Amino acid sequence: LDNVIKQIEALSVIVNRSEKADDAQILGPNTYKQLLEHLFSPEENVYILLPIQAYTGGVIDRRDASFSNFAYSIASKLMMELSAATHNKIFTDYTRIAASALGPEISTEGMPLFSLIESLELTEAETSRLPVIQDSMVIQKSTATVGNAQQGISTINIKRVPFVGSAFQQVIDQLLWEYSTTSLTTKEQRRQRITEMVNDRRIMIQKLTLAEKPQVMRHVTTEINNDLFFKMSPVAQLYIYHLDRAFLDGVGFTPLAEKQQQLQLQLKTNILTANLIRSAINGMNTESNLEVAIKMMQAAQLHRASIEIAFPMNVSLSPEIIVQCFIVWMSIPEQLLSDRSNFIIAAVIWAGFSADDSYADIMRRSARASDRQNYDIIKAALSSRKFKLPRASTTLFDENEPVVRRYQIGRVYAPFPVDRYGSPVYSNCTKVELASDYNAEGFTIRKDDFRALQAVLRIDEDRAADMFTTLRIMISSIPAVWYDAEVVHYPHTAVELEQLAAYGLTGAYPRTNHSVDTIVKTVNNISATYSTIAQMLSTIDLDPTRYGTSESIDKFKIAWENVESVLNMEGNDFVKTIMYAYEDNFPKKDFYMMLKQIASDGQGAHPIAAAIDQLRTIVYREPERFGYIDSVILTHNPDVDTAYNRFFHLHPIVTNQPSNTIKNAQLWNEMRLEQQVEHIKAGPVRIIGPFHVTYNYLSEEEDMPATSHIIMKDNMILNDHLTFNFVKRERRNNKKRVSSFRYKAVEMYVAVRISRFQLEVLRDLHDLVRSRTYLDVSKSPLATTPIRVVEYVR
Amino acid sequence: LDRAFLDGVGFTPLAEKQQQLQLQLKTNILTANLIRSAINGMNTESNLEV
Amino acid sequence: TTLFDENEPVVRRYQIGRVYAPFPVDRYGSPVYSNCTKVELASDYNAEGF
Amino acid sequence: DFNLYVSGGASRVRNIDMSTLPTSINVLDHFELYGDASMKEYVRSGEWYGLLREIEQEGMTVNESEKVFANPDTYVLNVKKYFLRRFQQEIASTGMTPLTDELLNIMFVHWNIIVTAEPKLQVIKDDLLKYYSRYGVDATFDYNMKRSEMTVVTRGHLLAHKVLECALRIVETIYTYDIQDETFKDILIDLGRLIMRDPIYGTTTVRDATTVMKQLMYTQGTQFRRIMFKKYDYSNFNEKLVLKGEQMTNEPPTLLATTHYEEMDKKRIDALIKANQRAGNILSQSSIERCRYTDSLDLVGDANRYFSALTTLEAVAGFASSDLLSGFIDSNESIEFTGTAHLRKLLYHSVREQITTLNTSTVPRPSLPKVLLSSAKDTASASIEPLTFRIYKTTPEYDGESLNLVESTVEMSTRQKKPNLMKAAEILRSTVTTNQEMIISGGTRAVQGGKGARAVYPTKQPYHIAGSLLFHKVDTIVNANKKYRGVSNKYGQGISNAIPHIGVPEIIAVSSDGMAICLALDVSAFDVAQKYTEADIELAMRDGFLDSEISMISGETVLERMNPADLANNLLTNTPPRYKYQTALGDIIILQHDNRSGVPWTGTQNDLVNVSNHHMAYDEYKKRVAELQRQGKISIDVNDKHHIVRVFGDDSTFIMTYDEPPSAEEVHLMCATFVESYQDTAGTLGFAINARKGMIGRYGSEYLKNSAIYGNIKSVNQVKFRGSEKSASYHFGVSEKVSMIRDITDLTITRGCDETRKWKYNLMMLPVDLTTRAGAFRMHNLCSIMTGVGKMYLGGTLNNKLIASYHGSSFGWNFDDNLIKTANSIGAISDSSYDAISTKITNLADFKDSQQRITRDIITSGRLPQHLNRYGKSNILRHILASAAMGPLSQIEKNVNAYNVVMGILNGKLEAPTVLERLNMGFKYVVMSDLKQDDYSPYSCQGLQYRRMLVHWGLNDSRITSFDPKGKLQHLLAKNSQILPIHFDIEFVYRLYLQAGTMGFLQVMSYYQLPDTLTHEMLAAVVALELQLGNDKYAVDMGVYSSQAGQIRINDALMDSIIQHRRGPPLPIIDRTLNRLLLHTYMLMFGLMGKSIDSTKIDPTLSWRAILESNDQRIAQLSELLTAV
């Protein structure tokens, strides 16, 4: 029942906040994690590495008991957990000993070799082999190549240090090393690419010291060039309009009173005599100058969004209409108006100077399809030796401001008829001579009134510096490829005649107080927020077959969810508002299709997409380490396989050939009592569905009788965890025969057993060492303080 | 049968439509744009029968 | 609008038929128009006085 | 630490004695604890204290809130001080005359005059005399004119004064209204004797009975005399109505309350018996028998006066109020939210859409320097915060010649709104407009009828300034005044309201036409009701200004350094401030979420919300009506075509038209359906509608205090100058008294009162009033003085000033006008007493802040400072500092002028002929014929002759063509914006003309960059204004209409036709507006006598002299230009 209103923040504040932090340029040191091993030995020269569960997650598919889904879920969740530990880190730190006048630098990276004496009960003969193992694990150095063709081809130095542990540990470490070091590069290549990208000699980049050249830095997967901005064209007009709206906070118009006073001094008529030109401009105000200035700038940038004037007349004319049309003709350049507007004002002008033609007939005969030719032939008639009315024009300015940016710029028209000198520019000639007066259904204009009108519409000649600084900051901050974008929202290019006339009479120009860096930062933010969604689509959704371009509109709600979620991530607010404001002209479907095309063209999906696929194979290979197994077997009077008795005194492992297997659980659970007894009477019965199994290894000193396999309450229901019990055979007691009493005295008539099991045995202690790779910070140190331009030297 | 099975109807209210119309068409007052005036006088409570 | 003959299989006893869509939208979300789209016209609506 | 909340029992103080049981000290525990029943025992309320104190001895936090509550000591108060304080903020007593003069003057010297006509009035004198004789002494009226304010001081009784007030207003009302029927003045006397005993609480007790009596008042009738008008197009707001004829009809009006007749009869009878039971046993059987007489009347003869007369008796006691705390407690309790979020979304979307369509426009927005000086002009009672470090009154004032003349100086500060334009330096620059639990002072107002206490929430200057800029473009279109089928039509905010025929034409028409019905539902406390939807409507207001605005948010907090869009984020952010007002036994603060009051947009918000829920109610009312139609009730073929909703702030109306008029019971069914639809669809979110509260029904519509039945307007009058509130009429000048003495009574006669008896009673105190005090110098003006202001006793209520003045040469009357001129015009010396800048300077950046483009530099446009320095572009603020402070020393300039007016009659001064009659204006060859002689007029309460005049010429229209120079130049000034300089208003033009004659006015303004034609036109308007009547601070400020003269069509449309066409050149405007005004006055007088003029020649032998004037006048204007002096 209570609400608190939230005050909105300015665009500049959001842009500044988005660049504050959360950037992937600077790395940091890291070290590998150790996984539990619990190794032991039954007798001489044999050592066992018992697999121990390393990740307790994973959850059973209750539908269809699909096997691929379970493994994919486990692998994906474990990967998302692992990738949160190496976010911006590379493995460099490790535990060495020394290198001093003794054998070279040796390593102690796995568990200490000293503890193996207690953990494995070595004898006096094998103890002598431990010092040579410790003294034989030297460190080897090598090199690797990183960087693609788009970036540079750098070389880095890597170590390869031995350690003691399990093979699964080694493969996990190798996978982590592969995943962590994608898209690496050196400073000495980043600098070269940057100076290549910035072709301006006035800007010079900080030179690198000799100790910083081989430093290692992380770069983006794919650079952002003009190609990404070129595919923005279907919606570029809205972005351009809003960018102009957000950075044009004021207008430098001269007040109307001074213009009235200047006109009064020029007119030769008496103060008491009434004249319509003087009395018409008095009904004007400059309060809509900012909007018209923004629209004029937009029309200057894009040559398709020409200004379309909306007039308040249908057939007849009025004294204000004529003078406003003349002001527009003599002040507003023709390159910023549509063909229809040019023809309309030209016809209004020509209706009075013509001997016989009128207004209504000159509009009723012509057709709007081919008005350009009519405008051209009328303009020629006004540039003959009988009539000479100058028409305001403009030219192209290529002035560029020095700033760091990634995209090319181009030429734009200027929103005023000036040519960098106070004198204005006209298409035909700078003279006003006419054969006769102006008359059209009354409203005569005297001969010299036009000459007086020309003398007041001149630019102040003083504000030129301010009149050009804004054009400077606007030319060199809008990508050139957007200049061919169409118009998607008509109201952004429609002004009324009175507003345009008032704008042209005072000679207003756009003005600004911001700098150039803010606008380019905003453009970079736009590009970043598009690239984020592009790679998300390319890594989650991109799929050719299976519901492509022909699917029910019902499915679109599912697809739009991810894009909507990404568009609300505290820093993408610029695009989100544009989307939710102009939905009706650019609906969601075409936006989604454009994003699909952008992602399909070319885009690095993610380092994790291949990582999960590579990890799924490891998940398939070793089930025990991930705490699951399939195809448990139920039987009574089982038998041992006599192939694992060498390692365990007694084990849940059997070798019976199954019969009449059950499809999956919850069918054996509810089948019936004394109906499943017939199944077990005929022989072993196998349950296929995967389970969440945990193993417990115990010595021959105690027991852990969990044994919750089968619960009898008017049925034979399977459990959900199925914990099993092993007993280790050790050198302390290996010639003793266990009576096999506690195993069966705690179980029931029906026994639950396991068909297959995996363990690794070793014959020599030398085989207990594996390898990992590092970064060798001594020769290729991690980088800090990324490349910057020089300014504030002190 | 159609009357007994089509229990309810789904429709956006007129306020939303007027809002979107003004957003899609920016016209200054004192110009007699009869599209706005005519639509501004409608009611939509007769939707089930239609 | 166009005909539409997609149905959910279910056991019945009588015949089934095709019905016109009272919705101007197609199955894939694109609007259906009889002659042409992107309304454009090179004149103004000149009624008697409106 | 404690405060008293009382509702219903004693919310208004009543007549109690300070000596029966004063009970010097009392324990408050005797009553009850409002919040919790369990925590009320006073013993536990003391043993808790004991235990907590013993714990505190060991050492404890002992939270003061919990500790001191348990102390039984705190519940102590003295009843006498409480009652005195309650009385001294509740009842106001300013009036115009002290009552001790009115008491004996109307009851012991002129009583024979009163009794000889109405004998029923002896009972009032009987009651008063017995009341004085029985107790005695306690009756007290010692007035304390300590500084300038009269404050009564109670002794024996608290409401003894109001008792006398009511006793005198009863005889005042009975005498002035010429009731010509029996048992009606009776029932008035019984109602009066009921309000006698309890003067304030009894007013509210009988308010129910009186309002429910006014509700029906005409149902059981036999003839009605329907008034017929031309068809009116409800759609176009600008449409006007013309009268066409009458017809007699027996059909009773089909209003509401026919369904709920018993529910209201029982309610009023219970109210009356409740009043009587505590009263002196006034034979309730007579009351119950007689109250049923009020609805057995008819709209013929002199029965129309009765409805107007009944309301006047309702406000017998004057300007009482109610406790503020109690009202702020209950008004925030009777509000329910329970409803759906869909309705909230509908409200939000409707408001946002409606703001967007209005903000986008081409109307210009005034700059900050202009808007600052517009705020001072507003002088909102909430906005005013005068502050002056020290304005030393070192004025040498002449003193009473009791024995010797004395000259003395005494300092005095403020006494007028001081804009703190000196502190504008800070306000224009650093000043953040955001609210964070700050505290501001709160003021209260009082109303007639004793309905309750109205609270005003003043806002700080930055908020008012910023707000005006944000809504200037919405407010202008809403108050277009001239709008034609525009989307704005819905809003009626812009109306004259001063007269009913022009201001609210639709209601009168809807009341006579039988093919339409009117829905005049009214709501409960609307401002408080929005406290649950403010978060949504304010949010809609905020984002409605984000679109349709080209500027974007940039986040600034300093005024003038912000975009139009920026203001919205900062201003419309909810979080209202806290308000501190003074009450009895303490001062309380509160926090109101809602539309607030002094907010720079309260009317816009109220009309936006009112027009929003109306659409949602109509939407579902249509569904309910369609449901009834499919079943057999309202029947088919009864379908409306056009429905129009008109909103003016809180109040609103609903008009629906039909092709076939539904029968009587159909109207009841549909009205009941609508009122049930609104109460659940548009009342589930706080609003509350009652069918018994508004004149819902057919054949009669009721707008704000103006209602019309069968084409007969039933205005409510209820204006009381004799007992006004927040005034110092007892210390006013003779000029202000004579201006107020003539116009309030004119309104009283216009809205229904006999011209003879009202003016007879007024004339019985003209000597007793208008007694100026001049230091042992007392005057007593007689009836002659009213001629000078422009009133003829033998004539009607018409401003016959000029015609009198021309003939005011032989028959006296040449003295009084000079007397009022010497009482007023010499204040021009006060105007000529300009105060220079001396003691302080400050940032003084203001002079740089306000500037206007110039032609004759700053050392030209008038070589001599005689008309140059006083209106200097550079001196703009120098001038307005003095031109904003006349009153604070004009009140004592009147006091010194009180010496001069006596000295005029002491010496040979005065008695000189005027200057107006020197100029010779007149006509020749006038054609004159009989008036129409028929009486059908929509204003049935007025006299017979005035009705005869109205039918002959018809209703006045357009309220502009008729000159009325008070408002003509104001309309011209309003239409002239965007070319005007910074400082301009009616006051400036009038004072400039008065100071500089007809030369300097044109001289100064012809160099201030304004075109000549319209300046000359409004100069003609202002000289017409100055010749229509004298100065009068009340008359020039705001302004007052001639009423009868504005409701009769004598505008320039037909006045041009009356004047015969001239052959010569077009006459100048300096004299055309004079001779046509003379013709207008002549037309208004002969008609009262019974004849009309249809032709008139200009007497061109006088017209040539008039065309000669400009010949040599334009020459003077241009010749002084020819020399660069």
Numbering used by the authors:
A (entry chain C): 61 to 854
B (entry chain D): 303 to 352
C (entry chain D): 454 to 503
D (entry chain Z): 301 to 1425
Give the published text.
Like other members of Reovirales, MCRV packages its dsRNA segments and a number of RNA-dependent RNA polymerase (RdRp) inside a double-layered icosahedral capsid. Using cryo-EM, we determined the structure of mud crab reovirus (MCRV), a 12-segmented dsRNA virus that is a putative member of Reovirales in the non-turreted Sedoreoviridae family, to near-atomic resolutions with icosahedral symmetry (3.1 Å) and without imposing icosahedral symmetry (3.4 Å).
All copies of the structural proteins in the D5 reconstruction were almost identical to those in the corresponding icosahedral map, with the exception of the well resolved ten RdRps near the ten 5-fold vertices. A hallmark of the MCRV non-icosahedral (C1 and D5) reconstruction is the ten well-resolved RdRp densities located slightly offset (~30 Å) from ten of the twelve icosahedral vertices that are organized with D5 symmetry. The MCRV RdRp can be divided into three domains: an N-terminal domain (residues 1–617), a central polymerase domain (residues 618–1090), and a C-terminal bracelet domain (residues 1091–1422). In addition to the distinctive arrangement, the RdRp of MCRV has two conspicuous structural features: a specific protrusion on the innermost surface of the RdRp, and a long loop that blocks the gap between the thumb and finger subdomains. At the N-terminus of VP3A1, residues 59–69 form a loop that facilitates interactions with the RdRp. The extended N-terminus of the VP3A2 interacts with the RdRp, with residues 40–48 forming an anti-parallel β-sheet with the residues 1220–1226 and 1390–1395 of the RdRp. Together, these two unique conformations of N-termini in VP3A essentially bracket opposite sides of the RdRp and likely help anchor the polymerase to the capsid.
